[PDB]
Design a protein around this ligand. Structure first.
Ligand SMILES: O=C(O)[C@H]1NCC[C@@H]1O
Ligand SMILES: O=C(O)[C@H]1NCC[C@@H]1O
Lengths: 348, 348
C-alpha cells in the first residue's frame, strides 16, 4: 500500500492536462515561483514588450500559478526569457496576485542563488557576476562564493531617486498621512508606522494591508507618478511602512503593501533601493555605509549606496541590496481540463 | 539556456536535504496536501494514538509543509497510515495551520477522488467503496464511477448530533451571539452571519476571521464540549457562519473559521454533517432529502440524512456529504539544512 502511495509520485496525468514545472524559493520568507517549463515563447524586442505579451495573452496562467489553490494571496513568480540587451545573461518578467510585474529585489536574490547553487553559471570566487534584463532595466547580480558555495547574493539596481519629499495627503477614513515617494526600480510611498499608530509586526498584519492599500489608492488618485522614460513604469507599486528596528544592529523595519493588498515578508529589495535614495538625499547615510533593514517577520537585507548618478532630471544613486535565498520545492503543477477552478481564485 | 533552465527540473539536492513528496488537490477550492513520502512510520494501535505520536514528535514537519513558505495560513494536509480497524483500507491523520487534526470532509472527498483516479483501488461501477479510519472513527467513502471516470465522491460520516440548541453567549467587543453547537466528526458553533451584520462573501473575509475566532474563544472558555467516548475529541473545532444562498437551488452558505483563524474555502464536510444533525433535530429536513450548501467562493457540497441512530445519550444521524476534487500538483518539498526558515512561519 505504502508503495502504491509512494508510486503516486510517478503517476502521469492524461495528455490533454497542462503541465507547468517550477523551482520554488524563499528570500527572507518571500516566495519566488521560478517557471522552468509549460509557457510558450514570449515575443518582444524589449522586456516591457514581453511583459505586454504576457499581460494580454497569458494572464489566465499567471492566476493558475500565483492564486489559490496552487499559490496564495502572497505568492510571487518569475518568467525567464532570452536576454534583449547585448551583455545580459537572461531577461525576466515577475508576477504577483494582481499581474505581471516590474523589477523585484527578493526575486533577483533568489535567481542569483539558484544560478550558482544549481550550476547554470560557473561558480567564480570571490565574486560571480550575472546580468539580468528586468522590466526596469539592466540589473547586475554579484554572488559572493567561497569553496564553491554561495555565502550571499547582492545586486546593484537601476538608478534610484526621490520623486517627492515630505508630502501630506488626506486619506478618507484615516486622516492626514505624511509620506516620501521614491523609486528603487519601483515607486513606493514611505510612511512612519508608529506615527500612524501601527507597528511593523505580525499582530498588525490586517491593519497594515487595510491602511497601506488606502494610502496607496489615495496617492494614486491624487499624484502623477511619472517614470522619466517609460509610461508602463509610471505607477505607484506600493506603500512601505517604516518601523523601529527590533534588533540592535538593524537600521529600521519595512512592511511593503503592493499589488492587490499583497504583503512582502522580505524587507523588499526595490524598497531598500528607494529607501537608500531617500536617506542619501537627506544626508543621513554616506557612500559605502552598509545598513540592515528588517521585515514584518524580522528577516533582513543589507543596503548600501554604491555611487551617485543622474536619471532624467533627478539626482540618483546606484544602490546595493544584499541577502540570501533557499530552495524549498520542485513543483509539477497540473491543470485538469475538467477543473472548474483551473485558473484559481482570490481571497485576502 | 532554456534547456539548462528546463534541466533544473532534474536538479537533485545534496544527500543531507530532507525530501517530502506530495500530491496536492483542491475540493471546492480547499486544498489537501497528501504526503506520499518523507515521514517515518507512525506507531499506534488507534488513530488517536498515531495522532499523539505525530503531535509529540513531528510537529516541525507539519509546520514545514502547512506553513509558508512551502504552504500558507489556509493549507491543509493528510498523513496516510496502515488501517487500525478490521475492515478499513487505510488510516489518516489530517493537519492544518495549528496542528494534527481530527476528521475532515473536504479531505475525505479528495482522497476518494485520488484513490480511483490514480488507480490505488479498482474503479468499480456504479459505486466503489473505500473505508478509512479517521481520528473520529470509521468513514465510508462511496465513489460514483461511470466509464472508468469519477463522477462524484460521497462519504457517510460518523454519527452526527446536536450538543446545544439556541444558546446565547456574550462575546466581548461583539455582544450577545446566538448559536447551535453540533458534532459532524468535529464540533462547531453555528451562528447567523446577517444577524451579526456580516455576509458570507469574500468582501467580509477579514471580519469573518476576527468575529469567528472571538466566538470560538468565548465558547471554548465558557462551555464543556465533551465527545461521549474520547477526551482528545472533546474541543470546539470552529465557528460556522450561516449565510443566505446566492444560487436558486442552494439551501444556505457556510464559512467555517477553524484552527488558528484558518478559513475553509469549501462548505466544510464535517460542517454539513453537523448542520444536517441540526436541521433534522429541528424537523426542517427528512431522511433522503438532499440539500446543497455553498462556501465563501460559491463552491458546493450536497448533504443528505441517510438514517437515524444514537451515539452515547444523543439522538444522532448518519450524514452523507457529496462533492468532487481535482489534482493541482505533484510536489517535491526540499529542506536545505542551512535554511533558517526550514520549519516555516505564520502570518494572517
Ligand atoms: O523585493 C522586492 O522588490 C519585491 N518583493 C516582493 C514585492 C517587491 O517587488
Ligand atoms: O471539510 C472539512 O470538514 C474540513 N475543511 C477544512 C476544515 C474542515 O475540517
Amino acid at each position: 500500500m505504502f508503495k502504491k502511495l509512494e508510486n503516486l509520485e510517478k503517476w502521469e496525468p492524461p495528455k490533454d492536462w497542462m503541465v507547468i514545472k517550477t523551482l520554488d524559493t524563499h528570500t527572507a520568507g518571500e516566495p519566488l515561483r521560478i517557471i522552468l517549463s509549460g509557457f510558450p515563447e514570449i515575443p518582444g524586442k524589449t522586456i516591457l514588450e514581453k511583459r505586454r505579451y504576457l499581460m494580454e495573452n497569458l494572464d489566465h496562467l499567471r492566476k493558475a500559478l500565483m492564486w489559490e489553490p496552487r499559490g496564495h494571496a502572497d505568492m510571487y513568480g518569475a518568467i525567464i526569457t532570452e536576454p534583449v540587451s547585448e551583455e545580459a545573461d537572461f531577461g525576466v518578467i515577475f508576477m504577483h496576485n494582481e499581474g505581471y510585474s516590474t523589477m523585484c529585489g527578493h526575486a533577483t536574490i533568489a535567481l542569483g542563488k539558484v544560478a550558482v547553487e544549481c550550476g547554470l553559471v560557473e561558480a567564480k570566487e570571490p565574486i560571480t557576476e550575472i546580468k539580468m534584463d528586468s522590466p526596469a532595466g539592466l540589473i547586475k547580480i554579484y554572488v559572493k562564493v567561497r569553496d564553491g558555495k554561495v555565502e550571499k547574493v547582492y545586486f546593484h539596481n537601476v538608478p534610484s531617486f526621490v520623486l517627492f519629499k515630505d508630502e501630506t495627503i488626506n486619506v478618507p477614513g484615516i486622516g492626514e498621512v505624511k509620506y516620501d515617494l521614491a523609486y528603487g526600480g519601483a515607486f513606493y510611498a514611505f510612511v512612519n508606522a508608529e506615527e500612524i499608530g501601527l507597528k511593523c509586526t505580525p499582530e498588525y498584519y490586517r491593519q497594515l494591508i487595510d491602511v497601506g492599500m488606502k494610502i496607496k489608492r489615495a496617492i494614486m488618485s491624487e499624484k502623477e507618478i511619472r517614470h522619466p522614460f517609460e509610461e508602463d513604469l509610471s505607477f505607484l507599486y506600493g506603500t512601505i511602512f517604516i518601523g523601529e528596528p527590533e534588533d540592535e544592529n538593524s537600521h529600521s523595519r519595512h512592511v511593503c503593501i503592493f499589488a492587490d493588498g499583497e504583503v512582502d515578508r522580505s524587507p523588499t529589495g526595490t524598497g531598500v533601493s528607494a529607501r537608500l535614495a531617500i536617506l542619501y538625499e537627506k544626508g543621513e547615510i554616506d557612500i559605502g555605509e552598509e545598513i540592515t533593514i528588517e521585515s514584518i517577520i524580522g528577516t533582513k537585507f543589507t543596503g548600501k549606496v554604491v555611487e551617485e548618478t543622474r536619471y532624467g532630471l533627478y539626482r540618483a544613486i546606484i544602490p546595493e541590496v544584499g541577502g540570501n535565498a533557499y530552495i524549498v520545492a520542485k513543483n509539477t503543477f497540473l491543470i485538469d481540463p475538467q477543473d472548474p477552478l483551473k485558473y484559481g481564485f482570490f481571497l485576502r
